[PDB]
Amino acid sequence: HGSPYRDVFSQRILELQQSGDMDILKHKWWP
Amino acid sequence: ILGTNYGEELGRGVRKLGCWNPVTGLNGSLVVLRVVTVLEEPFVMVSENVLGKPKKYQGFSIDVLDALSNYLGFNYEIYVAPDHKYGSPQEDGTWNGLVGELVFKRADIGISALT
Amino acid sequence: DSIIHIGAIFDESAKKDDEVFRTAVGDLNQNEEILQTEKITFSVTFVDGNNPFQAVQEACELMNQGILALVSSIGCTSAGSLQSLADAMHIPHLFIQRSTAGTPRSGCGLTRSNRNDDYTLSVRPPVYLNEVILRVVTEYAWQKFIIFYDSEYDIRGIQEFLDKVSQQGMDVALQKVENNINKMITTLFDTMRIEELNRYRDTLRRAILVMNPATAKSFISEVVETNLVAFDCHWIIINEEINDVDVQELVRRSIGRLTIIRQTFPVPQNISQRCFRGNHRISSTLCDPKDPFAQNMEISNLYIYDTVLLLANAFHKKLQDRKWHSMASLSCIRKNSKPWQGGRSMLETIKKGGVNGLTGDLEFGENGGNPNVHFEILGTNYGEELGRGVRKLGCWNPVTGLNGSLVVLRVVTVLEEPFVMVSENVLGKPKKYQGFSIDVLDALSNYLGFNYEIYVAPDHKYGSPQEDGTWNGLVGELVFKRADIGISALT
Amino acid sequence: VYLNEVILRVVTEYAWQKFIIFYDSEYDIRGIQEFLDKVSQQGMDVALQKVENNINKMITTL
């Protein structure tokens, strides 16, 4: 509850989805 | 001030265009587009994938853009739409897919098979 | 009787160089180890440093009195004329370049005729401003910025930097800042509009100030007051000479991020070894950093002290090797003007000298210039807890380059495939986790540059919420703040 | 020296907005400082480049 690392995590989650680095992971555990 | 000219009749050469001095001055008269796209072969097809994301796009829509680009003489960059959605009426709020990127202005043009 | 006599030519602005020069002669004449039986005497003349004929004439009068070496503290305008005179007369010339009004130094670019032997030794190091600034902008990944320079700055000093940024495709604007800033900015608001103004404000988000500290302080205040910059701005100020008072005032007048790059001097730390170099004792006024004079010393003043220390060691070696050549009364621009016969041997003895002083180590390379220099890089920070302030980010020197770049999270997880999956059990409990969630965590750890340790939740479940709002499991670990972050498929 | 004034008038007549200034190894760029300030005030994209005395190496390296 309250954290200064929250902001950079939410930014990185968007950034992984947008880069398509997140899309490789889905195929990996889910072919 | 000297200047070149050319015609088929005269060929190459040079002539006096004008003069300048500090008193009377001069005498004698002398964009990048942002493309949001949605991946769906064969309209936009990935020709080369680097770290699970396309780097070079091929297909019918990209060739049409190379014809458009040469005529207006604009250059572009292509990034993939992160949501993998084309967009359609959102009553839940904000526009998703290609349509939301243009509405909120995160691209200038959208190249896809958007009905 | 004195056989050791040196001459000095100072610009009219260099009164502090004269004070330190006289103090350095005083300190050496009290040192029994160096020049054991001989006192150093001197003749000093002040000249208009923009009059090269006056500089030559007065230097010639000192040579008529008879000197072993000529020390100069002067700008580039008369430097070429003194160097060519020293070459003609065979008088060793110890040249301390002064900048005009605290402007960043640029190379003189005198291009002295190389047909004759060079009697000039350049006491201050090469100008490395262009190299240092290039390294710092590269580290910050800058691609578009503006360079603001003062009215006295020689832009040939950044020509190499401009070529390099252009080769890398950067959008680099130049602008001279007039000595009167208010008129330049006031004229700007009157002529421009909202679009243009937004564009100028964007341009001012990243800037480099190549200017004296006084102009930079005025320039920063005026743009801050007129709201042309904001908290997201990042300005770099570079100059060899910015004192601690100047640094604090620059940080105080600035909003956003400020990087300050200035020359630093690698002197001993211990209080005892501060005012001593071996057995040479330095006057307290120059070496004690709590003395008001020492804190207000110019950079040129430090080099002048070390120059006198170097000359005394050279003269000492020449007298202890039975190679002394007496000084001669020389005449300039006469029918039988002749160089000093002792000059070539004295120049070579001085050139291979080296001393530990107020600048660190003073010595000369083969090219006749001092090679030694160190820059420090300071930077602002902000939190609600600390407020405004400044700290040392790093160091730069031309040998080792840039040094110094410009928490452990407690992770609770719950095993639940395929989000959290045990890749390695050691003693029946996980060491390595893999999974959809974990791969996102390893993209987080590497990217934000944090370290972690992962432990399971006390039951590998999110648990049930106990009566009165009490939580257990993984969730209770977040509420009781017993885990920093939770990596799981937590709903 | 009126080089800076003359060049400004000519670029203005041709309606130039983006260009590169190539200068020799002996040119003093303080001679165009006023021209550079003026083009910047008008929002132009102006590149500078020194041309080395040996051109082939500069272009071959390119």
CA distance B108 to B102: 6
- With an 8 Å Cβ cutoff, are D9 and B22 in contact? no
8 A C-beta contact, residue C431 and residue C425 = yes
Experimental technique used? cryo-EM
**Mutation site for B-interface testing, chosen from A12, A24, A29, A30 by largest number of B Cβ within 10 Å:** A24
Give bridge partners of residue C174 from the DSSP assignment.
C147
Q: Which two tokens stand for residue B7?
A: 């015609």
3 state SS of C421: strand
For residue C5, the one-letter residue type is H
Dihedral, CA atoms, D55, D58, D60, D61, nearest 10 degrees? 170
Buried b (16+ CB within 10 A) or exposed e, A14-31: eebebbbbbbebeeeeee
Name the neighbours of D, counting chains with at least 3 Cβ pairs within 8 A.
B, C
Neighbours of chain A (3+ CB pairs under 8 A): B, C
Give the β-pairing of D45-50 and D18-23. parallel
Q: Do D5 and B22 touch (CB under 8 A)?
A: yes
CB burial readout C326-353, b (16+ within 10 A) else e: ebbebeeeeeeeebbebbeebbebbbeb
- Residue in C436, C447, C450 closest to A29 by CB: C436
Q: Would the CB atoms of D10 and B22 count as touching at under 8 Å?
A: no
Interface check for D3 against chain B (CB to CB < 8 A): the answer is no
Helix (H) or strand (E) holding D47: strand D45-50
Among the partner-chain residues A14, A18, A23, the one whose CB lies closest to the CB of B52 is A23
Identify whether the C-beta of residue B27 lies closer than 8 Å to the C-beta of residue D13.
no
User: For residue C375, how many C-alpha atoms fall within 13 Å in the half-sphere facing its CB?
Assistant: 29
Backbone φ and ψ for C88, nearest 5 degrees, come out as: -65, -40
**Which of chain D's residues have a Cβ under 8 Å away from the Cβ of B30?**
10, 13-14
User: Are C174 and D36 inside 8 Å of each other by CB?
Assistant: yes
Quick one: resolution in A? 8.8
**Calculated CA dihedral for residues D55, D57, D58, D62, nearest 10 degrees:** 130
Tell me if D47 and C166 make a contact (CB, 8 A cut-off).
yes
Closest by CA position to C5, among listed C63, C45, C47, C89: C63
Inter-chain contact A5–C479, Cβ cutoff 8 Å?
A: no
- Interface probe for B, chosen from D6, D7, D16 (most Cβ of B below 10 Å), is D6
By the 8 A CB rule, do C302 and C267 touch? Answer: no
Residues of D in contact with B25 (CB under 8 A): 9
Among A11, A16, A24, which would you mutate to test the C interface (most chain C Cβ atoms within 10 Å of its Cβ)? Answer: A16
